[PDB]
Design a protein around this ligand. Sequence first.
Ligand SMILES: [Mg+2]
Ligand SMILES: [Zn+2]
Ligand SMILES: [Zn+2]
Ligand SMILES: [Zn+2]
Lengths: 519, 93, 168, 229, 171, 84, 61, 58, 88
Amino acid sequence: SQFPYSSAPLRSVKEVQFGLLSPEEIRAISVVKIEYPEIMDESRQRPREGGLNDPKLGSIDRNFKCQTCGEGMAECPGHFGHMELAKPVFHIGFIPKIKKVCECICMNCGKLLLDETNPTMAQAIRIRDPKKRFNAVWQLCKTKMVCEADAPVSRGGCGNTQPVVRKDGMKLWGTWKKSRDAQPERKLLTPGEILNVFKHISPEDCFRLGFNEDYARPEWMIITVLPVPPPQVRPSIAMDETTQGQDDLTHKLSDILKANINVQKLEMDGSPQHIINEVEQLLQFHVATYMDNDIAGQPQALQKSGRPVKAIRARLKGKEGRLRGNLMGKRVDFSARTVISGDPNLELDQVGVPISIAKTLSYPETVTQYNIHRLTEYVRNGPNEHPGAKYVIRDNGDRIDLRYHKRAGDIVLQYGWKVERHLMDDDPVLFNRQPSLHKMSMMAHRVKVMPYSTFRLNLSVTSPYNADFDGDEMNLHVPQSEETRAELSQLCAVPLQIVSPQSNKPVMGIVQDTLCGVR
Amino acid sequence: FGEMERDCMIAHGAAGFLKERLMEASDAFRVHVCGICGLMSVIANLKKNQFECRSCKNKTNIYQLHIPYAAKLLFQELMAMNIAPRLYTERSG
Amino acid sequence: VSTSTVGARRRRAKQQVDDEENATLLRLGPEFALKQYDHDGNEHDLIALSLSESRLLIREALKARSRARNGGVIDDDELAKVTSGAVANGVVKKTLDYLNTFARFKDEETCTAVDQLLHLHPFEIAQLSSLGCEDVDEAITLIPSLAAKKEVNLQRILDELNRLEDPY
Amino acid sequence: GLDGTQVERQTIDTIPGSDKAFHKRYYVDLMDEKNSIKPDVIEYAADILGDVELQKELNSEYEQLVSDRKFLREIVFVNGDHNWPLPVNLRRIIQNAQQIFHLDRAKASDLTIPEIIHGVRDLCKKLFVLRGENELIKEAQQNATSLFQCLVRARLATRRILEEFRLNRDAFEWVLGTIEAQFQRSLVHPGEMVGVIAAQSIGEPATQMNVTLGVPRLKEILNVAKNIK
Amino acid sequence: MFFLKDLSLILTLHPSYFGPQMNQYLREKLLTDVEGTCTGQFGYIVTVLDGMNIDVGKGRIIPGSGSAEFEVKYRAVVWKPFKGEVVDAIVSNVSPIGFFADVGPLNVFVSTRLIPDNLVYNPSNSPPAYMSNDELITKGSKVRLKVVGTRTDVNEIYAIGSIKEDFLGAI
Amino acid sequence: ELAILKEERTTTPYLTKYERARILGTRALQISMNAPVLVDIEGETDPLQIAMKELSQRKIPLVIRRYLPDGSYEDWGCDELIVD
Amino acid sequence: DPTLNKTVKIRQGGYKGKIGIVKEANGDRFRVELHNPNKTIPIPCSFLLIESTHGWVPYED
Amino acid sequence: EETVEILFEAGAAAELDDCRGVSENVMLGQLAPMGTGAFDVMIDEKLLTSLPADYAPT
Amino acid sequence: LKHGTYEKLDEDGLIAPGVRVSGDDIIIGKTTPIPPYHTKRDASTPLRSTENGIVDQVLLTTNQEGLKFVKVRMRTTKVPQIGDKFAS
RNA sequence: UGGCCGUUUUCGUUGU
Ligand SMILES: [Mg+2]
Ligand SMILES: [Zn+2]
Ligand SMILES: [Zn+2]
Ligand SMILES: [Zn+2]
């Protein structure tokens, strides 16, 4: 209901298809090319077009509406831009896989070292698990020291001995044994070399290698075009309001652009080999640390402050990664926290709720004939009076703020409108403690409005929360919809929790004063 | 609304509540996708009532899905990592 | 907004030049493939309807709808009022006019006769029924999709069709 | 196929005790009167003494119990522990029936043995767990309720009913209906994310706790250490 | 080439409209909504078959919104022009850039470069039209033209008619 | 195909707690947003209470569609389900 | 409304004679904040005393 | 664990995820096939035929 | 501008001691010149919205670098009530 | 005359 009208039909996600990006795909999707390291045109507002801060990428501020979609911050999901590398570069996260794929195929003919003739391999092809299939294929083909130009009848091969590829950290060296012994002249398996080698690989070997011609085409594992995410993904931090500091990701993107531009301007001047190699390694280093700053064995990249950079791998890993940070769990709305205290005189399924909270939180309520009067009363109570409401909602989704509305009486409720009435007694709300070891650490209680600013629990229910009033705290949550209210009532009410499926026995019990007394 | 809270909510088998607690009381967001490539790239202008997928040249096979903003953020961070999750609204097999 | 019966149809590695519509090259597109599927999935190959058969089907459906609305008790433009909407009313009126002016066959007897006579590709036969001519000469001059089939039998077909031709 | 909350430590008396005690408890003999039902507890003591068509039903049921005792005692519980969690407590249902109909005193039972055994045998085939007519379905149904049916028979034996409980006809009907419904409600429902529940139930107790015993041992087990300490 | 097509459209109903006869209500909603639209996948929608006996089946309840959706599956009759069609045409107006040949629901565009040389326009005569040797294109007369262009704009397809090939024109 | 005929339905006929909760919430929502009420209201102005009462009378027009693990489904009526 | 952000007292009510400040003046029920307690109370416009050029003026300023 | 490595493998193998598990829709904010979401709700038109004749929706 | 109130400041922008303060009230109004009329932006220092009391002692001196450098010591008394903590 | 904007990252101390 929050979103405006949209013509596209609404459905749900059923399938997620993983697979790399074909560079032509990136070009087909990108809406701009990024060429200018200078983000700000001349410090005269209007950042340089075609720069990292291009207005085509996506609106970053309230005032400016995204040029491409034509909407504002509310709706625009940002947009993408591509970035060409003069020199194709590796992907730091595929070094072992790329190495293995190279081991599995020839150098020059660039085909599988073995045919279906060997029954071991034809058997391996029968593996449906692409990962295990590739594992076995590598297992067989890692001992084929020489690529056959002829059938083990020409197979179209090269016949040269396949080099032994050993991982030199960030680079790859192949030590050939040229045709008793010859001088072994290894060389750097340069990215373009591998890309061209992969470019002609057959769909036959592709599928037999576990890859997929439609989505996972092996050569794309080498970085050629690097898409640039709009600012949405790399917003800047206003250190002190007017003072604005640049996101480290934006800095890394700019530095990659600089290294790329420099790599462009070597071939048009004196390029004594050594300089080109060093600059190439530097560009690869930028693009790598840009995508993982924790590459084992080598020093990390820093800012001018010396602190290690924030590569996306960090953004996703660790406790605070996107998953464990904001997807598995997240900070939520309509909550409240406080201390807890005893209350021998409350029911089992009830809980002291300080008045201020019930005044703060609120719950939408559709307009029917059965509550029109009561809702009008809550309206006229004003938001600062319990019971009271906080907003009035139209059929179109507008919110009337009762704070800045002096015409409270002149509002006429309408069927289907919603009124965020205050919390009232007997309503259902969740309840919780941390840690939430066993499912008897969460329950759905009923509301009772009271003075003072603490929650109160019946002294019996402490055991399931494993709580005590020596200073402990609790959290709260509130349903914002009726179906949710129904579910809470029917599934998480305290009474249903009395016996613990852990040990098929009652979990609560008469404790402390009640017990020692009734004795 | 930490992990363990999610797990307790699952154990109590309350689905819709968990859904909305992670949807409407949090980063509720809408997007559009192309039914061919399956991606979110469809350039749309709502008030202008137009739609198209640049790569797919696609003007009619477009849908809209409601997802947590953090999820879309994760997808974009991914497809900047050369990894492209394509979203399909129908199963294949 | 609207949907069809084909599912999946994802982006594949291999594209197709056989996607631009062309009636002479027998290029109908992906959604009009040789073997389509119905709502229930049964064997349902494509239906191609002649101008007169389409006119008769639309007319009978429209009169049935008029009867259902009346609930217990024909003119081309009068039949156009049944549908709701000025644009819908106009489009139904104009398609009825086009059927009237170019439906080679009018009455139930003659349409049934041509259906029994004509009734290998479904579309080619449907278009042959839709396409009229004078002799085999005009048929070959205007229809580049039957040049070489080793079974023409088109002269007698044209003679029969012109025999059913309502005099005007 | 049972929820974990709908079970209770019960005792199946068929397991423990001596052969002598078993015989003296469950066995019946219509021909011999010195070891037969007391006549002051039944309205038809005359119709029974020395009869056979009843003796055959009693023999069939007693053989069923003998087989059950052998099976349980030799397969399920080797050591002899007869206390276990089982669904739908019985003693409580028995005494609720007693109270509901004022079943004290020595008033003679007006309930025919054939009706009792007919109901018991019918009941054992009514405890639905899986509903369907495939053979395998029926075999699974049989396998599931094996120990529960053993308990039911261990309790509702004709001697037991007529002497220790002295139910009447309607009391017995209510007992059977009660057991049926109570068991039918005691099923694990569809959709229970039982995995999560088991995970939590196993994890929590660890919080409160010459061989190596304690959390280190549990960690070893969970990670499957090749070389235990 | 008219076609019979198996058309299905998903419809949305508010829970306030939950009574004995949602079937019929969905039916006239479909009749009112689907009919008269032109689309690239299918084309102009004109008529639907057995409007009074559509099997709407068992509907869905959207979770969390309370709306109910029905997958109205039905068979209709629609038309769309494809490239390489030779069919008779109707002319209703004459313009210098090409006579307006309203062939059925749509308008057919006539290129100025694709008109026979001997065919010329005479403003003086009433009705304004073209006359030539054994040829005349006037309002209401049968004319043969070939369509070699089909530009669809998802709302109203654009058709290009030609009379610059063998045996194209007024019979 | 994915449906299974009512003669051969095999799933349990009792209404599971989850089904109870989902139907109650769905109906109470619908009730609370101008849906018709299939039973009488006397004092229980709460839509959830109306739904509870209506279920107690077995007067709720909703069909459960249970999905089998394979993908097939069967259709039970809220009317026929034995509510405990 | 020119009658905001002014020192105001209570002439009648349970807080007879307490100095308060007008924090919010939506309409016809003035929200006034006191000094002695740490709280704000609503109160009708006619139950207050408004400071003026001289002396304390009731609701006519 | 190994979120980045798992994601890279998924991309490499062109893997396809069915959203069958629970956590999937949890990230995608959809009703996971659990508990209350372990089935569907079919609106019946047959039983609503039992309604009084004057309750026809407008 | 903020949503709070400013009237408690002096004519020069500081609040005088002895004035009661409430939540969401501005106590120090600072202005920043806007890089290019209407070329100033609020840089206030509102009171913590969860606090109340009376301003007690305003200080106004130069910093090490010779700019104005203020300090406001707001006070209040805490009454024990429900939810406190105590210990032997 | 609506409409309406307050940092991050570290480290620390504590709390249950
Ligand atoms: Mg403690
Ligand atoms: Zn945009
Ligand atoms: Zn080779
Ligand atoms: Zn696309």
